[PDB]
Motif scaffolding. Structure first.
Motif, PDB file in Angstrom:
ATOM      1  N   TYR C  26      34.152  45.008  36.356  1.00 16.39           N
ATOM      2  CA  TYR C  26      34.529  46.266  35.724  1.00 16.39           C
ATOM      3  C   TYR C  26      34.181  47.467  36.609  1.00 16.39           C
ATOM      4  N   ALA C  27      33.183  47.400  37.499  1.00 16.62           N
ATOM      5  CA  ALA C  27      32.910  48.495  38.431  1.00 16.62           C
ATOM      6  C   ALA C  27      34.072  48.583  39.436  1.00 16.62           C
ATOM      7  N   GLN C  28      34.559  47.454  39.974  1.00 19.95           N
ATOM      8  CA  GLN C  28      35.736  47.487  40.855  1.00 19.95           C
ATOM      9  C   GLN C  28      36.952  48.001  40.065  1.00 19.95           C
ATOM     10  N   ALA C  29      37.082  47.636  38.782  1.00 23.89           N
ATOM     11  CA  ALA C  29      38.153  48.160  37.946  1.00 23.89           C
ATOM     12  C   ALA C  29      38.000  49.689  37.828  1.00 23.89           C
ATOM     13  N   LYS C  30      36.775  50.204  37.633  1.00 19.97           N
ATOM     14  CA  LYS C  30      36.464  51.644  37.559  1.00 19.97           C
ATOM     15  C   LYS C  30      36.855  52.341  38.860  1.00 19.97           C
ATOM     16  N   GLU C  31      36.527  51.742  40.001  1.00 22.12           N
ATOM     17  CA  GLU C  31      36.881  52.257  41.329  1.00 22.12           C
ATOM     18  C   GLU C  31      38.409  52.308  41.494  1.00 22.12           C
ATOM     19  N   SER C  32      39.134  51.303  40.993  1.00 20.15           N
ATOM     20  CA  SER C  32      40.602  51.285  41.051  1.00 20.15           C
ATOM     21  C   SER C  32      41.216  52.340  40.106  1.00 20.15           C
ATOM     22  N   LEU C  33      40.679  52.485  38.886  1.00 22.30           N
ATOM     23  CA  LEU C  33      41.125  53.466  37.892  1.00 22.30           C
ATOM     24  C   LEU C  33      40.893  54.886  38.415  1.00 22.30           C
TER      25      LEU C  33
ATOM     26  N   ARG D   1      46.102  47.512  47.623  1.00 17.29           N
ATOM     27  CA  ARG D   1      44.640  47.415  47.494  1.00 17.29           C
ATOM     28  C   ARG D   1      44.278  46.631  46.225  1.00 17.29           C
ATOM     29  N   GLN D   2      44.880  46.981  45.089  1.00 15.90           N
ATOM     30  CA  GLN D   2      44.776  46.275  43.805  1.00 15.90           C
ATOM     31  C   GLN D   2      46.205  45.837  43.450  1.00 15.90           C
ATOM     32  N   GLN D  22      36.792  49.573  30.633  1.00 14.61           N
ATOM     33  CA  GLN D  22      35.538  50.318  30.812  1.00 14.61           C
ATOM     34  C   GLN D  22      34.785  50.330  29.475  1.00 14.61           C
TER      35      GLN D  22
END
Lengths: 50, 49, 50, 49
Positions: C26-33, D1-2, D22
């Motif tokens: 979820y931190a990598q998801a936060k970085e992507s968001l 990247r994603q 989140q």
């Protein structure tokens, strides 16, 4: 142990207060960042104050 | 809303400041919440004791 | 009680593995968001694939 | 990247799901944190026993 409860309740109050104030000012700052990057994510370059 | 004029002509740098705040938001709430929660359980223990 | 300790240690390990994995993912998801909401927060609509 | 090609035509739905993820971060970290520390307190009861 009742004295420990009291100090614990004082400490809980301190953390609850501290977290409430901290989350309020930091959430207002986070919401400000979201308003900036939603309403004006370099959109000011399209406006250009022409 | 935040600031009175506060360099609105080119406000890009402020977003970077707010990012450090946003990171610290998570740290400050995650730790604080965990501390009160630790004591909530300890209170229950103390209560159980 | 030593059986309980063994199973509890296995469970501590599972909680540590899960809490680590989810915080990283979820931190990598936060970085992507945050990259999306920084670089292209509706900027794609300004472009409109015109 | 994603992703490799990830719905670039209309990506707002992914921002909303990542915000939901989140929320899932906050739920999962707090639940894992309280449950592991509460079962650690059970371990302490067991240790004293």
């Amino acid at each position: 142990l009742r004295q420990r409860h009291t100090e614990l309740e004082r400490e809980v109050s301190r953390f609850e207060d501290q977290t409430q104030q901290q989350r309020q000012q930091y959430a207002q700052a986070k919401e400000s960042l979201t308003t900036l990057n939603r309403l004006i994510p370099q959109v000011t370059l399209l406006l250009d104050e022409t | 809303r935040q600031g009175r004029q506060y360099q609105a002509e080119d406000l890009e740098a402020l977003q970077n400041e707010l990012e450090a705040r946003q990171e610290a938001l998570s740290l400050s709430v995650n730790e604080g919440g965990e501390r009160r929660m630790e004591m909530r359980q300890e209170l229950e223990q103390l209560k159980q004791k």
